[PDB]
Design a protein around this ligand. Sequence first.
Ligand SMILES: CC(=O)N[C@@H]1[C@@H](O)[C@H](O[C@@H]2O[C@H](CO)[C@@H](O[C@@H]3O[C@H](CO)[C@@H](O[C@@H]4O[C@H](CO)[C@@H](O[C@@H]5O[C@H](CO)[C@@H](O[C@@H]6O[C@H](CO)[C@@H](O)[C@H](O)[C@H]6NC(C)=O)[C@H](O)[C@H]5NC(C)=O)[C@H](O)[C@H]4NC(C)=O)[C@H](O)[C@H]3NC(C)=O)[C@H](O)[C@H]2NC(C)=O)[C@@H](CO)O[C@H]1O
Ligand SMILES: [Ca+2]
Length: 435
Amino acid sequence: AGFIDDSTLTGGIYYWQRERDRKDLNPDSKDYNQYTTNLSHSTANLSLDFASGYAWDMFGLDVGAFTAIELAESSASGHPNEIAFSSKNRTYDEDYSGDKGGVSLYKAAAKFKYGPVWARAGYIQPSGQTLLAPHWSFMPGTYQGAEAGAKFDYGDAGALSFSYMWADKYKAPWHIEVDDFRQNDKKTRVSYLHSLGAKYDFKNDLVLEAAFGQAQGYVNQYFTKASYKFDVLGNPLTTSYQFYGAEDRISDKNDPNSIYDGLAWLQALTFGYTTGQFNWRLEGTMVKAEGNQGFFLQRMTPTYASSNGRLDVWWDNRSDFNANGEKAVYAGVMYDLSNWNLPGMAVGGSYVYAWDAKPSTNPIYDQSQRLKESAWSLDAMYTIQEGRAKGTLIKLHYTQYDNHTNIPSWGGGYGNIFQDEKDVKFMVIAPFTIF
Ligand SMILES: CC(=O)N[C@@H]1[C@@H](O)[C@H](O[C@@H]2O[C@H](CO)[C@@H](O[C@@H]3O[C@H](CO)[C@@H](O[C@@H]4O[C@H](CO)[C@@H](O[C@@H]5O[C@H](CO)[C@@H](O[C@@H]6O[C@H](CO)[C@@H](O)[C@H](O)[C@H]6NC(C)=O)[C@H](O)[C@H]5NC(C)=O)[C@H](O)[C@H]4NC(C)=O)[C@H](O)[C@H]3NC(C)=O)[C@H](O)[C@H]2NC(C)=O)[C@@H](CO)O[C@H]1O
Ligand SMILES: [Ca+2]
């Protein structure tokens, strides 16, 4: 009990190797219809995290920094690769010019706790029930701001948790320095992001979550979720409905800052089931995103890396499958190899089928277009059981993504869709505790 007596000092070694090739569909290019190198780099990260206890069981603080080391990169590797640091230090300075190593302070937070109340402030990550979230590479992004919340415990009738967060700057993992928020024009200032959100846990495997947020004078964001786990033939079958919504506050549709027409939303239905050694997943999404952007974003600032928002649907099949009008169905399976006498090992695969994808409603693009995209992935995983490298995770991920058009990447009004892609990712994560 105390500031120093409960201190933790953990860290992690991270290694990341990647090769990603993409088809060039520009007709008068020299690589026409061939795969070209897009990302190719070896990168390592090192993190160190101090987390004090609580003095008077009320006040404490956390500090944390990480380094990034570039081990190898090709001339044709695009930038930024999001593991190393971008050569430009802030969000809205990004040139897509290069990468580099260095060191970043990603955690510097005073934390408070008394009775049913808690709070954090400084350089933080969202930790409560809001729809704000950080970008995650190996390390998370960081907001400059504060978060506070409390819990209403009703005993066995459940427990309501609510939380509010506010921030005026943000920094993605691949940036060393925080920057302000701005609109789609990357000029008009956004004073703050803030969000209120809550969760009710019935303590019978039914959970209701909801949150709304705001980018000052610009965007309004919404989130709801309902998840329930019950038995079918005596096995845990997990379920969840999800809703994500967004609006803008720009009257003029032709303004470069207007990104949505009316309410843009992403709705999702998930199913999970575990029979013996097989973990099955079956999930599907539907999107509506009328307006100039043409695709739904969970983050409230539309510029790349400016901020991030909560989104519980991740299929790790490269494409975000979030185009206006797009439907997508996902099916995966991981197979535990413990009954082959390989504990800690797992192999699995994924398949995504998407259809009915329409472009931005900006009239300069053909509104008659209908795009279909699919993908499949293979995953191998291993968590070391032996002593020395106990807990070190090894993951190999391969994905083959198919765009069923000849539209060049980012064109035709599909501002967030790219052409066919091969991707292989090799990860190693080794955590360690000093004290
Ligand atoms: C503890 C720990 O270490 N890990 C835990 C981990 O298990 C989990 O965390 C998860 O980790 C993984 C990585 O490890 C995260 O993976 C990331 O996933 C996101 C999607 O959510 C990926 O984001 C996309 O990234 C690509 C870049 O590669 C973006 O592509 C760009 O998009 C824009 C369009 O929006 C393009 O702009 C266009 O640019 C062209 C230029 O030619 C121009 O013509 C146009 O004008 C312009 N259009 C505009 C401006 O509108 C841009 O060019 C393009 N560029 C490229 C090269 O593609 C894409 O937009 C991103 N999508 C979204 C959405 O952000 C991200 O790439 C991926 N990272 C990696 C390394 O693969 C994962 O997100 C993370 N989170 C989760 C929830 O899983 C969990 C476990 O609990 O947490 C940790 O604990
Ligand atoms: Ca194709």
